[PDB]
C-alpha cells in the first residue's frame, strides 16, 4: 500500500524574505530516508535522513530566498521502494 506522506511547512507556507521556514515531511516508522522534489528543478532537490523515530523528517531553510520558492513534493523510502508523492506544498515568498 505505502501510505503517501504528509508535507507541510512551518511557521507557514508563505514566508517573507530572510526569515526561517521548516518544511516537514511525515512517513511511516519504517522509513529508510526522505527526499524533497521541487518542480522545474532536477530531482532530487534535497534528501534527508529520518529522525528518531523515523516517522518524520526535517528540511530547514534558515533564510528564505527566491530560490526556495515553488512547489515541493516529499517522498519517503520504505524497505521495498519509494512512495507515492505527497500532496504538493507551494512555498510563496513575500
Amino acid at each position, epitope marked *: 500500500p505505502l501510505p503517501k506522506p504528509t508535507l507541510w511547512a512551518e511557521p507557514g507556507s508563505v514566508i517573507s524574505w530572510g526569515n526561517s521556514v521548516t518544511i516537514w515531511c511525515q512517513g511511516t*516508522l*519504517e522509513a529508510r530516508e526522505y527526499r524533497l522534489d521541487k518542480e522545474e528543478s532536477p530531482a532530487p532537490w534535497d534528501r534527508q*535522513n529520518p529522525l528518531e523515530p523515523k516517522n518524520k523528517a526535517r528540511f530547514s531553510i534558515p533564510s528564505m530566498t527566491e530560490d526556495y520558492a515553488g512547489r515541493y513534493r516529499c517522498y519517503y523510502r520504505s*524497505p*521495498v*521502494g519509494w512512495s507515492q508523492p505527497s500532496d504538493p506544498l507551494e512555498l510563496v515568498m513575500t
Partner: antibody
Amino acid sequence: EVQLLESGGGLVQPGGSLRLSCAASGIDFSNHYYMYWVRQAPGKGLEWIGSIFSGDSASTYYADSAKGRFTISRDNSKNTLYLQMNSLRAEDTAVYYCARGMSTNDWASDLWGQGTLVTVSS
Amino acid sequence: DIQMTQSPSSLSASVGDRVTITCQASESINSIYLAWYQQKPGKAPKLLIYRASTLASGVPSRFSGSGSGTDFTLTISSLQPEDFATYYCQQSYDWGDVENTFGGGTKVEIKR
C-alpha cells in the same frame, strides 16, 4: 534484559511443514524493532529469511527464495514470533535463528537467539 | 535485487597482523544501515559494528569499520588467536526482491 528463546525445531519429513517459535522474554526500551529469521545450512553462509516489524502494521518482508514457502506471523497474546515453513526439502536443513534489530541501532541485530536445528529427513 | 559482496572469502593472517575485510554493494546504500557480524564456529552470530563505523557493546576496541556508498571495510588492528571466525556484512536499507541481506562471508584463519 531482553531474551530471544527459540523452539519448534527437530526432525520433519521431506514435503512436510514446521513452525518455529521465538518467544521474546522480557523487554527493554525498544518500542520499534524488527524480528529476523536467519538460517545457516551445514557449512554454508548465513541466509536471511525475513523480518517482521513490531508496529501495528506488522509489516512482513521475505527473501526472494523464501516467498510462498515461508510465512512469518506474530502472536501478541503470548508475545511469540512464528516462522511457518511449508513444503520442506532436504536442502532446508539448517540452524535457525531469530534476532532483534531496534530502530535506534538502525535495525542492526544486537540480540540473537541460541539457534534451533531443523533436520529434514525421512 | 541488492547483492552484498565480501572479499576475500578466505584469508590467512598471523597474530598481531592488521587485517582488513571489504564489503561491496551492487548499489549505493546509506551507511547507517550497514552492520558487521562475527560468527565463531557453531555459535550464534554477534554484532560487531553498526552504522558502518560504530563499535557495539562488549566488542573489543581492536575492531573498527569505515566506508560510504558502495564500499565498506572492517579492520582488526591487532589480530588475536580467538578472532578465528567468519565475518558477515549486512544491510537494512532495501529488502524485498532481495536474495540475501548478508554477504557471502569472510573466513579468517590464523597463520602460525
